[PDB]
Amino acid sequence: LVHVASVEKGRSYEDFQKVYNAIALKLREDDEYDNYIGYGPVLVRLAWHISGTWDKHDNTGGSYGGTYRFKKEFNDPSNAGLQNGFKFLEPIHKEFPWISSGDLFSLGGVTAVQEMQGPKIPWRCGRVDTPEDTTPDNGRLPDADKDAGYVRTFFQRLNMNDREVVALMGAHALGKTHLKNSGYEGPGGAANNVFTNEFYLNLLNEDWKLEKNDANNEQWDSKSGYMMLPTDYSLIQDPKYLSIVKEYANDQDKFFKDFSKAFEKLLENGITFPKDAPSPFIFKTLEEQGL
């Protein structure tokens, strides 16, 4: 199975910048969502979940086909809560019907990271919607109740190595767990709608207590009111992961650089870009445009 990127016919950088801008303007407007967190975090999670179904062995799943629009994937228990992100993007898709679903969902995540003062993430167009029978079965996204070995094995299916895994997980500074979605409750830190290296600082510096939550699942809770999933906490239990956590806690700029690469890689897994395709786009923030 090969998925060749095909640029939406007649579109160029400036067209996609307009879509970016619409997402960013709506992010600015809808600031009350989820007790004033806004939609940034859920859009990042959406972009990751539409990408994280990829299987490197047969090129099934991944962002290319936009298959989250189909009920089997939309209703995956692992995706509970992401419907909020999909509903946010609906008026954007109405305004720009020419964009593919996979391009829109992935672009929502790039837009969110940048508008939350995160790193620039280069982004490529050309994902093409595929039919309902190409939707991956449920069960391809990761469990939270597991250890470092599970995390490492899981992410190898996505061709992610240790540095990429640790960098990607820093997105857990954003937003929060919600008991009704996932059976976990609480934020990873204080700055949960501005992109920073707080996740790593908190892993290393907080006084964590293992507890059961109200859904009877184990999570690690701090005196400050923060939480870590067992899979988050595993990054300071495994010696290889711990070394990289310390690196990112000490150097936010290095984290930003590594996250940007890893996140682009995640969003592009499964896609073959013709050697003549446009170079990756780097979108201007609203602030950079005076908008």
CA 74/CA 50 separation, integer angstroms: 10
Among the candidate windows 1-9, 94-102, 114-122, 172-180, which touches ligand HEM by CB under 6 A? 172-180
231 binding ligand HEM? (CB under 6 A)? yes
Among the candidate windows 36-44, 100-108, 121-129, 240-248, which touches ligand HEM by CB under 6 A? 36-44
Q: Give the one residue of 171, 203, 227, 228 binding ligand HEM; rule: CB under 6 A.
A: 171
CA 156/CA 152 separation, integer angstroms: 6
CB-wise, 141 or 277, nearer to ligand HEM? Answer: 141
184 binding ligand HEM? (CB under 6 A)? yes
Among the candidate windows 12-20, 68-76, 168-176, 220-228, which touches ligand HEM by CB under 6 A? 168-176
DSSP 114-164: HHTT-----B--------GGGPPPS--SPPSS--HHHHHHHHHTTT--HHH
3-class SS at 69? helix
Q: Give which of 187, 163, 166 is closest to 175, Cα–Cα.
A: 187
255 binding ligand HEM? (CB under 6 A)? no
CB-wise, 34 or 128, nearer to ligand HEM? Answer: 34
User: Cβ contacts of residue 193 below 8 Å, gap of 6+?
Assistant: 37, 38, 40, 41, 116, 174, 175
11 binding ligand HEM? (CB under 6 A)? no
Strands (E), the chain: 3-4, 208-212, 218-222, 227-228, 271-272
3-class SS at 38? coil
7-23 in b/e form (b: 16+ CB < 10 A) is bbeebeeebbeebbbbb
Q: Considering only residues 82-141, where is the footprint of ligand HEM by CB under 6 A?
A: none
Q: Give the one residue of 142, 152, 191, 204 binding ligand HEM; rule: CB under 6 A.
A: 142
Question: CB 16 → ligand HEM: shortest distance, Å?
Answer: 21
Shortest Cβ contact with ligand HEM: which residue?
175
The answer to whether 6 and 271 have CB atoms below 8 angstroms apart is no
CB-wise, 171 or 245, nearer to ligand HEM? Answer: 171
Among the candidate windows 2-10, 115-123, 181-189, 279-287, which touches ligand HEM by CB under 6 A? 181-189
Angle, in degrees to the nearest 10, between helices 230-237 and 198-205: 70
CA–CA–CA angle 85, 90, 92 (5° rounding): 105
CB-wise, 80 or 291, nearer to ligand HEM? Answer: 80
178 binding ligand HEM? (CB under 6 A)? yes
Question: CB 9 → ligand HEM: shortest distance, Å?
Answer: 31
Site residues for ligand HEM per CB under 6 A? 41-42, 44-45, 48, 81, 142, 144, 151, 168-169, 171-172, 174-178, 181-182, 184, 229, 231, 263
